[PDB]
Swiss-Prot record, chain A:
Its main location: nucleus. It comes from the Eukaryota. The gene is cwf2. It is found in: Nucleus. The keyword Nucleus applies. Involved in the first step of pre-mRNA splicing. Required for cell growth and cell cycle control. Plays a role in the levels of the U1, U4, U5 and U6 snRNAs and the maintenance of the U4/U6 snRNA complex. May provide the link between the 'nineteen complex' NTC spliceosome protein complex and the spliceosome through the U6 snRNA. Associates predominantly with U6 snRNAs in assembled active spliceosomes. Binds directly to the internal stem-loop (ISL) domain of the U6 snRNA and to the pre-mRNA intron near the 5' splice site during the activation and catalytic phases of the spliceosome cycle. Belongs to the 40S cdc5-associated complex (or cwf complex), a spliceosome sub-complex reminiscent of a late-stage spliceosome composed of the U2, U5 and U6 snRNAs and at least brr2, cdc5, cwf2/prp3, cwf3/syf1, cwf4/syf3, cwf5/ecm2, spp42/cwf6, cwf7/spf27, cwf8, cwf9, cwf10, cwf11, cwf12, prp45/cwf13, cwf14, cwf15, cwf16, cwf17, cwf18, cwf19, cwf20, cwf21, cwf22, cwf23, cwf24, cwf25, cwf26, cyp7/cwf27, cwf28, cwf29/ist3, lea1, msl1, prp5/cwf1, prp10, prp12/sap130, prp17, prp22, sap61, sap62, sap114, sap145, slu7, smb1, smd1, smd3, smf1, smg1 and syf2. This is Pre-mRNA-splicing factor cwf2. Belongs to the RRM CWC2 family. Residues 1-15 are annotated as: Disordered.
From Swiss-Prot, chain B:
This is Pre-mRNA-splicing factor spp42. It comes from Schizosaccharomyces pombe (strain 972 / ATCC 24843). It is found in: Nucleus. Belongs to the 40S cdc5-associated complex (or cwf complex), a spliceosome sub-complex reminiscent of a late-stage spliceosome composed of the U2, U5 and U6 snRNAs and at least brr2, cdc5, cwf2/prp3, cwf3/syf1, cwf4/syf3, cwf5/ecm2, spp42/cwf6, cwf7/spf27, cwf8, cwf9, cwf10, cwf11, cwf12, prp45/cwf13, cwf14, cwf15, cwf16, cwf17, cwf18, cwf19, cwf20, cwf21, cwf22, cwf23, cwf24, cwf25, cwf26, cyp7/cwf27, cwf28, cwf29/ist3, lea1, msl1, prp5/cwf1, prp10, prp12/sap130, prp17, prp22, sap61, sap62, sap114, sap145, slu7, smb1, smd1, smd3, smf1, smg1 and syf2. Interacts with prp1. The gene is spp42. Involved in pre-mRNA splicing. May be involved in endoplasmic reticulum-associated protein degradation (ERAD) and required for growth at low and high temperatures. Required for pre-spliceosome formation, which is the first step of pre-mRNA splicing. This protein is associated with snRNP U5. Has a role in branch site-3' splice site selection. Associates with the branch site-3' splice 3'-exon region. It comes from the Eukaryota.
Swiss-Prot record, chain C:
It comes from Schizosaccharomyces pombe (strain 972 / ATCC 24843). Belongs to the SNW family. Involved in pre-mRNA splicing. It comes from the Eukaryota. It is found in: Nucleus. This is Pre-mRNA-processing protein 45. Transmembrane segments: none annotated.
Swiss-Prot record, chain D:
Belongs to the 40S cdc5-associated complex (or cwf complex), a spliceosome sub-complex reminiscent of a late-stage spliceosome composed of the U2, U5 and U6 snRNAs and at least brr2, cdc5, cwf2/prp3, cwf3/syf1, cwf4/syf3, cwf5/ecm2, spp42/cwf6, cwf7/spf27, cwf8, cwf9, cwf10, cwf11, cwf12, prp45/cwf13, cwf14, cwf15, cwf16, cwf17, cwf18, cwf19, cwf20, cwf21, cwf22, cwf23, cwf24, cwf25, cwf26, cyp7/cwf27, cwf28, cwf29/ist3, lea1, msl1, prp5/cwf1, prp10, prp12/sap130, prp17, prp22, sap61, sap62, sap114, sap145, slu7, smb1, smd1, smd3, smf1, smg1 and syf2. Interacts with prp1. It is found in: Nucleus. Disulfide bonds: none annotated. This is Pre-mRNA-splicing factor spp42. It comes from Schizosaccharomyces pombe (strain 972 / ATCC 24843) (Fission yeast). Involved in pre-mRNA splicing. May be involved in endoplasmic reticulum-associated protein degradation (ERAD) and required for growth at low and high temperatures. Required for pre-spliceosome formation, which is the first step of pre-mRNA splicing. This protein is associated with snRNP U5. Has a role in branch site-3' splice site selection. Associates with the branch site-3' splice 3'-exon region.
Amino acid sequence: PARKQIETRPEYEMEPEQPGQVYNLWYNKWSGGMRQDPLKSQVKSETRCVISRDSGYTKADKNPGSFFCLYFARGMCSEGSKCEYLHRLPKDTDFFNANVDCFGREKHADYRDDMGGVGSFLRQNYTLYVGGITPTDDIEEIVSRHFAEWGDIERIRVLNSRGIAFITYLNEANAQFAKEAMAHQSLECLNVRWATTDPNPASQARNQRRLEERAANAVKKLLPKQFLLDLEETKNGKXXXXXXXXXXXXXXXXXXXXXXX
Amino acid sequence: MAHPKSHTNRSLLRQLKNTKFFQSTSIDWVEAGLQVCRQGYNMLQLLIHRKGLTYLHLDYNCNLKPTKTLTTKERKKSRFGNAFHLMREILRLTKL
Amino acid sequence: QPKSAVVQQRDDPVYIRYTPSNQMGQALSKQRIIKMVTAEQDPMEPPKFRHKKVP
Amino acid sequence: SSRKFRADKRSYLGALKYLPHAVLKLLENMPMPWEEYREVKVLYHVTG
RNA sequence: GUAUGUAU
RNA sequence: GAUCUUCGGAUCACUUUGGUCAAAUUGAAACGAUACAGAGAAGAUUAGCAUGGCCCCUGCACAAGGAUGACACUGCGACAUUGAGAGAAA
Ligand SMILES: [Mg+2]
Ligand SMILES: [Mg+2]
Ligand SMILES: [Mg+2]
Ligand SMILES: [Mg+2]
């Protein structure tokens, strides 16, 4: 099972900027004139993965608490079949915890300036910042075709004035996963970055409301059944008599009353 | 001449041998001369690069020299100190 | 003084018991015996962090 | 040069401190003219 | 027209 | 496996894994290119020492340098009034 997208792999050797990048043995990079060429100008990927075609069983699937392979989302996981990490999309079951990005890489304090491949653990982002090509208004058919495959979406926005998209996602795991796969692809290469808070008050309140709702759902399992019984009971009653009756009976507090009788 | 002080034996080279980071073996002298002479070459290179001072290159004969030719602003960064140089010229001897 | 080469091994495995306090819920106690040990620092590695200056 | 040993590189400078002490053990052992080669003993940092 | 800083 | 010794039965040996990524664009130096401007002390030229820190480089340095390294503020006020004249509100 599995597909090894490239059996061979890639070996890195270079002399960019022709006359001497030197190479800084301490931190493995080159150093010379034209730093503007290094800031911008990222070159297109050689491969993109197709989900339905490539995905399959792995050695990780047998192990309960694994991660996904980073190279799978890049579409070059030379192992493929006998890969140690999962070769699927992140579902609601997969879970993970706070300081860990879906791919296993640890999170950090507070973002990059240019918004890198991992985000902060102090704020949560289900979103993605992009920079795309603009043929006509069939862009939205193209965007919705590709990004929908990587995960369950909440809402695709596509600003046509500036070729940019704020793509939120249903599961946070898909968002981290989605960014890597989309990034460095053609529809120049798409530019993928973590999203800053969207401008204006109303929109933020709308997002805050969604996050709060998400938290409430998470809490909801936790609360005591009698407390659970109540809010639900009150909504159904929308009852008074029942409440009164309950009050009379009452007259670790619940435990103490239980202990007495 | 002082008459020597009473003391327990410290001995550095048997402390390092007691941690799990050093191992022991027996080889030829000239091998372990080259070993050092190299080790020191790198240990300076990695210092030169960590400072991002990457327009100077040490020759394999512990000889430091600029390539680019620098501004006065780029020279003040170079200005390696009384130690490093002493450490270097002690290597130049070991090499010979 | 950084104590060059002077490397000491506090090499008594410190054993402990840890009584957990119903954190989320569920399993409560058990008591779980932890066994602490000191990983013995490589002699060479220079300082592991910078001197941040804050008012 | 290679990334495979990007860990070590922190220690490698750490060694620098004890280079002058390696020179000195080495020269106090130089083999002497009548010897053809001489075998010695060594401590190495497993880091090389 | 650099020593030394400001902007991309 | 080896040594004793009933084919039972002994005895010797006991839980590895220094990991900031699992495959060098988007998670660990910035400098450089370019443009502008272009060097304290109340004429002009000019040595300097200090001074204060969320500014720092070179230096083994509690020497010394880096333009004297660079950068550096100075309304308020704890409010009385006097005596006269005019105005609007109680
Ligand atoms: Mg001075
Ligand atoms: Mg002057
Ligand atoms: Mg001067
Ligand atoms: Mg001063």
